[PDB]
């Protein structure tokens, strides 16, 4: 890299991170999509 | 998954049961059976642990990916308990110990810690709370183990009124300290007993029955703010019971009496070690205490659990102690 | 000094010994066993870390599940695990042992060896290169180095 | 020539056609159909009663000497009443040729074991039994070869689910591996890939 | 507008590659191995 | 053409029979084996000093999957699902919708790295070089759940490994 | 290749063969790891006329 | 452009965030929620609009064979910019 | 899938020069070693007629003296344009099968020597985009190519 | 005709029923040996009950050929048990000890899920 440096991009990490498995900053999977079905919210005041 | 959590699926490993449980003391004898049943139906189980993560490994296979979650906690740190119950809808306390340690005595494991969990659970918004007590719990006995249980049971019933107290007898199973306790008296001589096992009546209960009872208390609505007494189907004399254990284990049975004070001293000798004591003064008292008969408390039959007779599932426990057995004489109901 | 300090050095000594003599029992079930053999080959020479090529199950400290675990083989693998003297660790090698991999949806494949035995390190790949497996063994050694068996005992 | 197209071999198509008639004439009692594919592979379709007669002739006859059983398998076509198609692939080292013999059966009708002709069929027939449920009569030792002990069903049948009906798992309460109904965290995604436009007009079936 | 460049052998091809078995013949004959062996015994006996 | 491997007749002249007698009694051929392993003792070993030395790889090496961007920061993936349709192990799960500005982008892009067979078909099928297999091969984890990547993990890998992915693609894009 | 002449003779004699001609370790006779860019050829069907697909 | 929910959890670029009463937040206790910080929708807005002198411009994403399939964008409508369907770059026609 | 990268064939040549010497070292440990011959000679003998009827193939036949090799009797690809020999056993035992395998490695090096010299130019996949996907360069410029790339991968 | 078909072993129900009993006697006499070799935690009587139940579920069969297959498969199962090809896990898969009972009443199904 001192002879052929990498191309610079503004989204590339400036700080390389080693394997974080087993540490408090590990990766935890989850769904990245929002809720599909919207349920009905009953009225907050009585009818009678 | 908006109001509580909606069950989904067939009730198998990859289903969703809607139960989000925090099981304190899940790394012990009764804990591994409670986690197995919760995780076997598709529940989100949170397992606080004080031990090495290596000692929690037998719990990882018990649930689908992401269903068993492990946290560090300290019995004397209220914040850690808060992090482990804030997201749960049911909290199960199985914290206990058969002996006192330099850092934890019976007033910590059975009174202060259970009350700490109950308080944090109440203000965290948890709706259901299951606490394990002892059948012979009352402040009148020579066992400091049983005196602590009575105090803790009252404090749990006060901090969390809607709690569900379970009062089981001596639980037997593969990893129990009851049938395996009456099988390790062979390297010293016969079988010491207060009196000769007479005037001591025991009503042991199967581990799966206790486990299945705790599960049904989570699902059952009419179990909030109630006390249960999980007991076996049959009653035995400690002499007859221990005789049966040795017969099933094919060990020579040579019972001889020993004075009550004499048994205390050998209990002192075996509690000087730094490891799990083989026996102690309190252990001898509890084994020789007579299992109370509380017919005013609903038991296993009130949760849809048929108590398992000790004769049916005693061979699976004592098989490993061996190097057509007559059932033990039982006390009639009368 | 404090009791924690004294019992923390003994923890280091036993942790050092156990990770410097990791003897593996390799369940070579499928192609991932070839890459396991390449980690013993001269280029990587796993024996230079103290990791003997192949120990008997009763002398073994770590089990490497390297390949597809089928239903027919599942009870056999559990029996070998139950007979391993402690402390015992399991390394899941490859996609088949990780989560079933290419045969995840088969009628005769266990969907991950972590339904039968507990797993300490998962090594991804199909197969992981011999260097990737070695990186996973050196991660298990780092995991043994972080154990606190005596601290937990002391603070009990 | 045409660089991207497979060249024909009309000499080998002629020879295999002649040998097919030869076999059809010598065994009219069983042979039901003979065909040669566009890539020069001879198929003899026979009645299942002719399995031993037809195979023995091809193995022993001086002009056949099909002394190797390359493979023996089954194909499940549910739309036929005889849903299974038993296929024999034979090799002749003397004449450097291959022949395929096909027959059929259903879930209940036995097939005759060709172990007396080719010893290699011992395990091939067990695999057919294990994976398709076709019973071979007079087999010296017929039993499952590939499936788990006590496995219910025959997986290679077209109506058997891909992921089966049971999955294994270790239960700590009973301290053993147990079988339970299959539940997949992610269901297999069934793709419908067929194009609605005919690809090969040469194979169009009559309306 | 350059030329096609793909992986090809050098002009003139590669050099010859040995494949035939090569186990060289070593040592003395059977007669001379027993002569040295017997002679060693005789000197030792003396 | 063919050759016989073991079809030679041993000579029966007295010299040859004595040459074979010397071999049997004096263990001559067992002593060549000792010479061949003494040779290897004085050859330099082929072992490398991992992890300070690494085994050589090539720009085509197939490692950890990762999601890339254009030079402007915009994601390359336009939620076409060709990678999902070709994955032999059915390890990719994609969901998509119109982004806030009308663009065609994924709301879900998961890869089950325990189903993946690390075959590279996805990066073959992608028309915009979005999903690639980077050069990383050291991402072993301690739990099964860390290998179920979602869109954030894959985008993080792309930002983390773009400097090296871009140079590997530049070295090999003319062969593909 | 860094072995001295003496150890070279010993390894050669014990094996019976000249090992230094064919070493199992790769020194600087292998291809450079950065190669010039290629320019691959096109197939027989890359034509602008007389290339109808029904004929091939 | 990572926004934080009232409880404190980061909102991902897909808009995902767990509600206040969702038990699934327990997976992040003792761990972290991995959220990519570079929102694509925000970075492609920063790119300047390109002024071209023709009705139809072609975009291939930049880089030739390393970009995306080459598409032609019509710029006759003066009330909006012509956006590339693959990469989001915008174009406008000079004074018409 | 792809074409050979520049510099590979020179690296295959360098590996192939030395590989016969590696086989000769293997033979210095096994072929004449009496202990190895005791474990393999006259062990597991298969008659040529049993081998054919039991469905054997490969050196399980050539070890018993059967002269059969699909690379020469039913050649595929360009095996009819290379020159090599088929090793044949005489006793049908483990030792003869071990010598067939070791001799097949020597013949494989012989074939590799001819592939390296006779490697021709051209493309590496059939120039029919309804079977083999087009190059990425033309998948990103031509409408037909993108259609055929799209449908060959879905 | 259409109804003419090859027999597997038995030409009518009477001959097939003979093979069923011969199989039942072989199974009935191996439960004590099976419960001993595999060190099962079940009793001999409930082991023989399971044998009876398996013979009872498919007791409505009237096709002689289907009966032959059920006996062919039954003998294969017996051979695996006698030879100890099976293990403790395979013998106990007849008892479904780990899956909770699925209620069979309409109301109980209605509360848990959408299945009939
Ligand atoms: C060179 C000569 C080689 C031969 C000599 C070898 C000497 C090696 C040093 C021995 C040091 C003692 C280590 C003993 C093992 C410790 C251990 O495994 O911890 C787990 C154990 C278990 O801890 P635990 O009690 O928390 O475990 C509970 C969890 N379950 C229920 C699952 C077990 O810790 C101990 O019990 C510590 C033992 C007491 C402290 C020992 C110090 C003795 C030092 C002098 C000897
Ligand atoms: C530091 C290390 C310093 C070197 C230490 C000595 C290493 C010697 C290892 C042997 C290396 C050479 C072996 C060799 O080439 O053998 C080929 C030769 C030839 O073996 P051959 O099998 O190829 O053929 C010989 C017979 N003809 C030619 C007729 C077929 O082997 C010998 O000469 C061995 C001599 C016999 C010695 C053993 C008997 C005496 C043992 C008891 C006394 C001690
Ligand atoms: C174990 C230690 C023994 C080491 C044996 C060394 C054998 C040896 O010297 O081999 C190498 C050498 C090769 O020479 P050569 O075969 O002539 O090469 C050109 C042929 N055209 O071979 C020779 O030139 C032969 C020289 C060595 C002769 C060894 C003596 C004969 C073997 C029988 C001796 C048995 C009695 C041993 C007495 C032991 C007393 C200590
Ligand atoms: C010994 C030297 C010797 O025999 O000279 C060679 C001579 C010529 O024989 P040749 O032409 O080589 O072929 C065999 C023909 N009979 O050989 C002869 O013609 C002599 C006759 C050959 C047969 C001799 C058989 C004697 C073998 C007995 C064992 C000798 C070793 C005994 C000592 C063992 C301990 C080392
Ligand atoms: N088993 C029986 O026979 C009987 C059980 N009970 C009661 O049920 C409860 C659990 O029973 P059981 O599982 O058999 O007992 P165990 O000894 O097998 O397990 C006790 C659990 O509590 C944990 N524990 C003990 N002290 C502490 C502490 N200071 N801080 C945190 N955790 C602690 C232990 O964690 P760790 O392992 O890491 O130390 C362990 O997980 C007890 O309260 C007991 O009184 C009631 C009647 C009979
Ligand atoms: C008095 C009680 C007896 C035990 C004495 C201590 C021995 C154990 C420590 C070595 C292992 C270790 O510590 O590992 C290697 C260490 C570095 O470890 P680190 O990465 O800094 O540790 C990080 C923290 N951990 C370990 C908790 C994760 O290397 C050293 O510099 C040690 C070299 C000097 C050792 C001298 C031993 C002399 C004692 C001989 C008689 C017992
Ligand atoms: C330790 C004290 C006692 C030593 C006794 C020595 C042996 C005495 C008897 C003579 C035998 C002898 O020398 O004959 C044997 C040979 C004569 O060589 P050649 O004619 O080429 O035989 C070989 C025939 N080929 C050429 C066909 C292979 O020996 C030598 O070349 C000496 C070798 C080194 C020995 C150490
Ligand atoms: S993970 Fe890949 S290499 Fe390993 S056994 Fe499975 S298919 Fe083979
Ligand atoms: S590399 Fe292969 S298995 Fe992995 S995601 Fe891509 S297509 Fe699927
Ligand atoms: S990664 Fe590529 S192939 Fe996959 S959906 Fe995105 S653009 Fe399509
Ligand atoms: Zn663009």
Swiss-Prot record, chain A:
Subcellular localization is given as:
Mitochondrion inner membrane
Query: Highest taxon of the source?
Result: Eukaryota
Q: How does it assemble?
A: Complex I is composed of 45 different subunits.
Its biological purpose? Accessory subunit of the mitochondrial membrane respiratory chain NADH dehydrogenase (Complex I), that is believed not to be involved in catalysis. Complex I functions in the transfer of electrons from NADH to the respiratory chain. The immediate electron acceptor for the enzyme is believed to be ubiquinone.
Concerning its family, UniProt says: Belongs to the complex I NDUFA12 subunit family.
**Annotated protein name in UniProt:** NADH dehydrogenase [ubiquinone] 1 alpha subcomplex subunit 12
Q: Which residues of the full protein are shown?
A: 98 to 145 of 145
Curated annotation (Swiss-Prot), chain B:
Question: Out of the domains of life, which is the source?
Answer: Eukaryota
Q: What SUPFAM superfamilies would the database entry show?
A: NAD(P)-binding Rossmann-fold domains
GO CC terms of this entry: mitochondrial inner membrane; mitochondrial matrix; mitochondrion; respiratory chain complex I
Q: PTMs?
A: Acetylated on lysine residues. BLOC1S1 is required for acetylation.
Q: Which residues carry this modification: N6-acetyllysine?
A: 154
Name the Gene3D superfamilies for this protein: NAD(P)-binding Rossmann-like Domain
Positions bearing N6-succinyllysine:
140
Name its co-factor(s).
FAD
InterPro entries given in the database record: ComplexI_NDUFA9_subunit, Epimerase_deHydtase, NAD(P)-bd_dom_sf
Q: Which GO terms describe its molecular function?
A: NADH dehydrogenase activity; protein-containing complex binding
What biological process terms from GO does the record include? circadian rhythm; ubiquinone biosynthetic process
Q: Which UniProt keywords apply?
A: Acetylation, Electron transport, FAD, Flavoprotein, Mitochondrion, Respiratory chain, Transit peptide, Transport
Q: Where in the cell is it found?
A: Mitochondrion matrix
Q: List the disulfide bonds.
A: none
How cofactor binds (record note)?
Answer: Binds 1 FAD per subunit.
Q: Which family does it belong to?
A: Belongs to the complex I NDUFA9 subunit family.
Give the protein's biological function: Accessory subunit of the mitochondrial membrane respiratory chain NADH dehydrogenase (Complex I), that is believed not to be involved in catalysis. Complex I functions in the transfer of electrons from NADH to the respiratory chain. The immediate electron acceptor for the enzyme is believed to be ubiquinone.
Assembly information from the UniProt record: Complex I is composed of 45 different subunits. This a component of the hydrophobic protein fraction. Interacts with BLOC1S1. Interacts with SLC2A4. Interacts with CLOCK. Interacts with RAB5IF.
What is the protein's given name? Answer: NADH dehydrogenase [ubiquinone] 1 alpha subcomplex subunit 9, mitochondrial
From Swiss-Prot, chain C:
| EC class | translocase
Summarize where [4Fe-4S] cluster binds, as residue positions: 31-32, 96, 126
Cofactor(s) recorded for this entry are:
[4Fe-4S] cluster
Give the note describing cofactor binding and stoichiometry: Binds 1 [4Fe-4S] cluster.
EC no. given is: 7.1.1.2
The record's keywords, sorted A to Z, are:
4Fe-4S, Electron transport, Hydroxylation, Iron, Iron-sulfur, Membrane, Metal-binding, Mitochondrion, Mitochondrion inner membrane, NAD, Oxidoreductase, Respiratory chain, Transit peptide, Translocase, Transport, Ubiquinone
Q: Name one GO cellular component term.
A: mitochondrial inner membrane
Membrane as a keyword of this entry, yes or no, is yes
Q: Which GO terms describe its molecular function?
A: 4 iron, 4 sulfur cluster binding; metal ion binding; NADH dehydrogenase (ubiquinone) activity; quinone binding
Modification Hydroxyarginine occurs at: 54
Cite the post-translational modification comment. Hydroxylated ar Arg-54 by NDUFAF5 early in the pathway of assembly of complex I, before the formation of the juncture between peripheral and membrane arms.
Name the reaction it catalyses.
a ubiquinone + NADH + 5 H(+)(in) = a ubiquinol + NAD(+) + 4 H(+)(out)
> Could you tell me the membrane topology recorded for this protein?
Peripheral membrane protein
| Compartment(s) where it occurs, according to its Swiss-Prot or TrEMBL record | Mitochondrion inner membrane
* Any one GO BP annotation for this protein: aerobic respiration
Q: Which family does it belong to?
A: Belongs to the complex I 20 kDa subunit family.
Q: What does this protein do?
A: Core subunit of the mitochondrial membrane respiratory chain NADH dehydrogenase (Complex I) which catalyzes electron transfer from NADH through the respiratory chain, using ubiquinone as an electron acceptor. Essential for the catalytic activity of complex I.
The record's note on quaternary structure and interaction partners says:
Core subunit of respiratory chain NADH dehydrogenase (Complex I) which is composed of 45 different subunits. This is a component of the iron-sulfur (IP) fragment of the enzyme.
Originating organism: Bos taurus (Bovine)
Curated annotation (Swiss-Prot), chain I:
Transmembrane spans:
none
Q: Where in the cell is it found?
A: Mitochondrion inner membrane
**Record-listed [4Fe-4S] cluster binding positions:** 94, 100, 115
Function statement:
Core subunit of the mitochondrial membrane respiratory chain NADH dehydrogenase (Complex I) which catalyzes electron transfer from NADH through the respiratory chain, using ubiquinone as an electron acceptor. Essential for the catalytic activity and assembly of complex I. Redox-sensitive, critical component of the oxygen-sensing pathway in the pulmonary vasculature which plays a key role in acute pulmonary oxygen-sensing and hypoxic pulmonary vasoconstriction. Plays an important role in carotid body sensing of hypoxia.
Assigned protein family: Belongs to the complex I 49 kDa subunit family.
Subunit annotation: Core subunit of respiratory chain NADH dehydrogenase (Complex I) which is composed of 45 different subunits. Component of the iron-sulfur (IP) fragment of the enzyme. Interacts with NDUFAF3. Interacts with NDUFAF7. Interacts with CERS2.
Q: What is this protein called?
A: NADH dehydrogenase [ubiquinone] iron-sulfur protein 2, mitochondrial
Record gene name: NDUFS2
Q: Which residues of the full protein are shown?
A: 233 to 386 of 463
């Amino acid at each position: 890299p001192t002879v052929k440096p990498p191309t610079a991009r503004k989204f590339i990490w400036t700080n390389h991170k080693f394997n974080l498995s087993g540490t408090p900053q590990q990766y935890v999977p989850y769904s990245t999509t929002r809720k599909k079905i919207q349920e009905w919210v009953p009225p907050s005041t009585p009818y009678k | 998954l908006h109001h509580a959590v909606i069950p989904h699926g067939k009730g198998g490993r990859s289903s969703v049961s809607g139960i989000v449980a925090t099981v304190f003391g899940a790394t012990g004898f009764l804990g591994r059976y409670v986690v197995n049943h919760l995780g076997r139906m598709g529940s989100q189980v949170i397992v606080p642990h004080r031990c090495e993560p290596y000692d929690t490994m037998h719990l990882r296979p018990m649930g689908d990916l992401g269903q068993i979650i492990f946290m560090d906690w300290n019995g004397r740190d209220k914040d850690s308990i808060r992090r482990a119950v804030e997201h749960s809808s049911v909290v199960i306390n199985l914290v206990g110990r058969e002996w006192e340690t330099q850092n934890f005595d019976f007033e910590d494991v059975f009174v202060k810690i259970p009350q700490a969990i109950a308080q944090v659970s109440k203000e965290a918004g948890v709706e259901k709370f299951i606490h394990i007590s002892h059948l012979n719990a009352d402040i009148k006995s020579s066992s400091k183990y049983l005196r602590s249980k009575a105090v803790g049971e009252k404090e749990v019933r006060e901090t969390f009124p809607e709690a569900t107290i379970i009062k089981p007898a001596e639980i037997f199973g593969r990893e129990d300290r009851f049938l395996n306790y009456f099988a390790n008296i062979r390297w010293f001589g016969g079988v010491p007993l207060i009196s000769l096992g007479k005037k001591t009546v025991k009503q042991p209960v199967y581990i799966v029955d206790v486990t299945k009872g705790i599960i049904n208390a989570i699902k059952d609505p009419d179990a909030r703010g109630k006390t249960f007494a999980f007991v076996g189907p049959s009653r035995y004399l400690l002499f007859d019971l221990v005789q049966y254990v040795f017969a099933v284990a094919h060990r020579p049975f040579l019972p001889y009496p020993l004075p009550h004070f004499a048994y205390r001293w050998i209990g002192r000798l075996f509690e000087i070690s730094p490891f799990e004591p083989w026996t102690t003064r309190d252990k001898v008292e509890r084994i020789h205490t007579t299992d109370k008969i509380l017919p005013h408390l609903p038991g296993l039959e009130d949760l849809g659990v048929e108590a398992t007779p000790l004769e049916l599932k005693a061979i699976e426990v004592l098989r490993r102690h061996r190097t057509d057995v007559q059932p033990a004489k039982t006390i009639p109901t009368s | 000094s404090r009791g924690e300090y004294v019992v923390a050095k003994l923890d280091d000594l036993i942790n050092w010994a156990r990770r410097s003599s990791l003897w593996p029992m390799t369940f070579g079930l499928a192609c991932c066993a070839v890459e396991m053999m390449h980690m013993a080959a001269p280029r990587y020479d796993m024996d230079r870390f103290g990791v003997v090529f192949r120990a008997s199950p009763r002398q073994s400290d770590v089990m490497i599940v390297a390949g597809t675990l089928t239903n027919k083989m599942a009870p056999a693998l559990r029996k070998v695990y139950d007979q391993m003297p402690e402390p015992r660790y399991v390394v899941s090698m490859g996609s088949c042992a990780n989560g079933g991999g290419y045969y995840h949806y088969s009628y005769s494949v266990v969907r991950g060896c972590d339904r039968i035995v507990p797993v300490d390190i998962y090594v991804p790949g199909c197969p992981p290169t011999a260097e990737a497996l070695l990186y996973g063994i050196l991660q298990l050694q780092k995991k043994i180095k972080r154990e606190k068996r005596l601290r937990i005992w002391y603070r009990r | 020539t045409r660089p991207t197209v497979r060249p024909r071999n009309d000499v080998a198509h002629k020879q295999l056609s002649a040998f097919g008639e030869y076999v059809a004439e010598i065994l009219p009692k069983y042979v039901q159909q003979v065909q040669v594919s566009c890539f020069n592979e001879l198929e003899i379709c026979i009645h299942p009663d002719g399995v031993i007669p037809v195979l023995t002739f091809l193995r022993d006859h001086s002009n056949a000497q099909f002394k190797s059983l390359a493979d023996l398998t089954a194909v499940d076509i549910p739309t036929r009443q005889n849903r299974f198609e038993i296929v024999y692939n034979l090799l002749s080292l003397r004449f450097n040729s291959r022949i395929r013999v096909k027959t059929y059966t259903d879930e209940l009708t036995p097939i005759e074991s060709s172990v007396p002709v080719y010893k290699a069929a011992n395990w091939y027939e067990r695999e057919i039994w294990d994976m398709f449920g076709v019973f071979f009569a007079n087999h010296p030792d017929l039993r499952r070869i590939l499936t788990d002990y006590g496995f219910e069903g025959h997986p290679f049948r077209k109506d058997f689910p891909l992921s089966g009906y049971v999955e294994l798992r270790y239960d700590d309460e009973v301290k053993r591996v147990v079988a339970e109904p299959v539940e997949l965290a992610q269901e297999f995604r069934k793709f419908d890939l067929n194009s609605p436009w005919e690809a090969f007009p040469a194979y169009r079936q009559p309306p | 507008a350059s030329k096609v460049k793909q992986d090809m052998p050098p002009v003139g091809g590669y050099g010859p590659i040995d494949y035939k078995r090569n186990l060289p013949r070593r040592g003395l004959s059977g007669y001379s191995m027993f002569a040295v062996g017997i002679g060693a015994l005789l000197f030792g006996y003396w | 053409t063919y050759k016989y491997v073991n079809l030679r007749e041993p000579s029966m002249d007295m010299k040859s029979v004595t040459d074979r007698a010397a071999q049997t009694l004096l263990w001559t051929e067992l002593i060549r084996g000792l010479g061949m392993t003494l040779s290897y003792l004085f050859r330099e070993p082929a072992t490398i000093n991992y992890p300070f030395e690494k085994g050589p790889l090539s720009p085509r090496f197939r490692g950890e999957h990762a999601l890339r961007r254009y030079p402007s920061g915009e994601e390359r993936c336009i939620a076409c699902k060709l990678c999902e349709a070709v994955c032999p192990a059915q390890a990719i799960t994609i969901e998509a919708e119109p982004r806030a500005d009308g663009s065609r982008r994924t709301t879900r892009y998961d890869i089950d790295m325990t189903k993946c067979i690390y075959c590279g078909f996805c990066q073959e099928a992608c028309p915009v070089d979005a999903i690639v297999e980077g050069p990383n091969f050291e991402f072993s984890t301690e739990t099964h759940e860390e290998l179920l990547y979602n869109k954030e993990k894959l985008l993080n890998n792309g930002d983390k490994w773009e400097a090296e992915i871009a140079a590997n693609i530049q070295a090999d894009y003319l062969y593909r | 290749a860094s072995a001295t002449r003496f150890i070279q003779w010993l390894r050669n004699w014990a094996s019976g063969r000249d090992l230094q001609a064919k070493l199992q370790l790769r020194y600087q006779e292998i291809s450079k790891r950065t190669q010039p860019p290629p320019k691959l050829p096109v197939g027989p069907s890359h034509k602008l006329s007389n290339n109808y697909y029904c004929t091939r | 452009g990572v926004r934080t929910s009232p409880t404190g959890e980061k909102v991902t670029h897909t808009g995902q965030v767990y509600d206040d009463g969702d038990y699934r937040k327990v997976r992040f206790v003792g761990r972290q929620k991995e959220v990519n910080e570079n929102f694509a929708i925000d970075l492609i807005a920063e790119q300047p609009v390109s002024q071209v002198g023709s009705r139809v411009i072609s975009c291939d994403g930049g880089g030739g064979a390393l970009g995306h399939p080459r598409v032609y964008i019509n710029l006759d409508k003066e009330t909006k910019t012509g956006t590339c369907g693959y990469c989001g770059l915008q174009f406008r026609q000079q004074h018409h | 899938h792809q074409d050979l990268p520049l510099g590979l064939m020179d690296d295959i040549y360098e590996f192939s020069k030395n590989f016969s010497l590696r086989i000769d070292e293997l033979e210095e440990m096994l072929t004449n070693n009496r202990i190895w011959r005791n474990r393999t000679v006259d062990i597991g003998i298969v008659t040529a007629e049993d081998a054919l009827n039991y469905g054997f193939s490969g050196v399980m036949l050539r070890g018993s003296g059967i002269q059969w090799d699909l690379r020469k009797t039913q050649p595929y690809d360009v095996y009819d344009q290379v020159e090599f020999d088929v090793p044949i056993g005489s006793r049908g035992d483990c030792y003869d099968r071990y010598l067939c395998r070791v001799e097949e490695m020597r013949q494989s090096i012989r074939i590799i020597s001819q592939c390296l010299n006779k490697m021709p130019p051209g493309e590496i996949k059939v120039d029919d985009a309804k079977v083999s996907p087009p190059k990425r360069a033309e998948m990103k410029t031509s409408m037909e190519s993108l259609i055929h790339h799209f449908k060959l991968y879905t | 005709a259409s109804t003419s078909v090859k027999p597997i072993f038995s030409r009518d129900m009477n001959e097939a029923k003979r093979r069923v009993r011969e199989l039942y006697r072989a199974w009935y006499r191996e439960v004590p040996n099976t419960v001993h070799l595999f060190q099962l935690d079940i009793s001999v009587k409930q082991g023989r009950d399971k044998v009876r139940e398996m013979f009872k579920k498919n007791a409505h069969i009237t096709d002689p050929r289907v009966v032959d297959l059920l006996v062919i498969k039954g003998k294969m199962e017996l051979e695996e048990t006698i030879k100890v090809w099976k293990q403790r896990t395979h013998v106990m898969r007849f008892f479904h000890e780990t899956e909770a009972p699925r209620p069979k009443d309409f109301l109980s199904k209605f509360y848990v899920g959408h299945d009939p």
